[model samples]
Target: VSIYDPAAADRAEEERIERWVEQLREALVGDGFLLHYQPVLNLQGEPLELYQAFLRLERNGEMMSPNAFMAIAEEHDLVTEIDRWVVARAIRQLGERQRAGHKTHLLVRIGPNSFSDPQMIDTIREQLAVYGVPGERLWLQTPESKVFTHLRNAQQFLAAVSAMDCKVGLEQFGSGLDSFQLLAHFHPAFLKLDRGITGDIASARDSQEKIREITSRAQPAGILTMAEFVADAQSMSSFFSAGVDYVQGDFVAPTGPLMNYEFG
Candidate 1:
């Protein structure tokens, strides 16, 4: 006689999600997450040793898409731990690349949770010392919205990280209107342009003009603006003409395991 199970499907899925949570912990302990890199290209046809390190997680069997699990992870309050572990892993990778005679750098994304944690900074300091990785090789990144949400704290943490020689980066920054306050406060070294144009020339032309206006604001502070999601050579042409210092997208090179893309 077989017993009828009413909650089997529900229990199984809950188990999977719970297992995913554990897998995140396992990933931190082992190799559940890996770095995928997108090369940032300069306008002058040169690579700047900067590869934005996208943290890839193992879910089910394949790499999960950007939105598939990240929102879920954030809900569980696990993203900060994930970012913390990735930081250490990137530091190790940096040391390895340096040993192999490659002038490579990884721009890492982090969560705001650790900003006020003195122990987190202390640990980062120790890891830098342990790995002998200079802070300059690590570009620490956070979203522009987060900075605005945690304005005072973000400024403090950005300053603290910069004091360690790490470059500060802002993703999806505000338009030119709020640029000056950011400049006066944060002085970020890398900024990903937040133009939402849909790749039309008329729109891209507008984007270029907008980017041109911001470059004037950004360039004076040695800020390198990254135009992401460039769809074609046409938009890239706009990028070059408009003085964008860096570009990254599927058009450039889809995220990969290492800095293998030849910038030309």
Candidate 2:
């Protein structure tokens, strides 16, 4: 009776997840979550002062990044609420900076679940007004796979956000030629190059050519390309030569509590 039981383990895991869901919900209500900012630099010229806001949750006594709890949040139907919180917080902070005469823009990632919420656009509009921030100052990012999976919903969501002048970014881009086809219908303002492609661009001819190929087409389409997770100077050089519009990663600066990265 006291021996190990697979069923018991499953139940224990489920119980643990439930606890995390409870904590995530609580964090949403309180100030238990943290926002970290990472700068995205324009390789062509002056810094745009654009930053991406990453979320962190305070669980127990330590800080937990999204990877640890995001899937759980998605499974438990809390991703939309989490997205709302992130957008509201990012806009509010941006409003403060704007009030101080700073031309700060934030790129916040929106969860796939939020696209299905009819109130998503309305809430975002309201948040911008409440904070007195311009819609153009906010950039929203959604994953490529999810956007393709929910094509109709994603299209409507893109149109609504576009009407507000808020820039939309598609992440995890450039897996194949089919990825470009998504652009025909959904014209996002930004296409974040797939990390896998950027990860080895320093030496991989295949990855380098992929970046070249994407940029060549992206420019004519009026879409800006961003290379995320750039690890070293070699990769940065490669991206610059490959015609990437923006690059972000540890080489530039790590994400932190403040947006004080020196952009040159």
Residue 13 shift from truth in candidate 1, angstroms: 5.8
Please report, as a residue range, the 10-residue window in candidate 2 with the lowest summed lDDT: 111-120
Once fitted onto the true fold, the runs of candidate 1 whose alpha carbons sit more than 4 angstroms away are 1-16, 44-46, 195-203
Model 2 lDDT per residue over 36-150, tens place? 9999999977568899999999877887899999899888888898888898889888998898878789999997777777667877888888888888999999999989888
Model 1, span 1-264: residue lDDT tens = 646676986788788778777777777687788788888778856566878888887766988654666765787777877787778778888888888877677888876776765755765677777878888988888888788778788888888888889887888765656765776877788888775632452355666567777788888878888788777787777778777788778877778886787653
Candidate 1's error at 161, in angstroms?
0.9
Pairs that clash in candidate 1: none
Q: Which stretches of candidate 2 lie over 4 Å from their true place?
A: 1-11
**Local distance difference test, per candidate?**
0.76, 0.88
Compared with the true structure, model 2 gives a TM-score of: 0.94
Taking all chains together, each candidate's TM-score versus the true structure is 0.87, 0.94
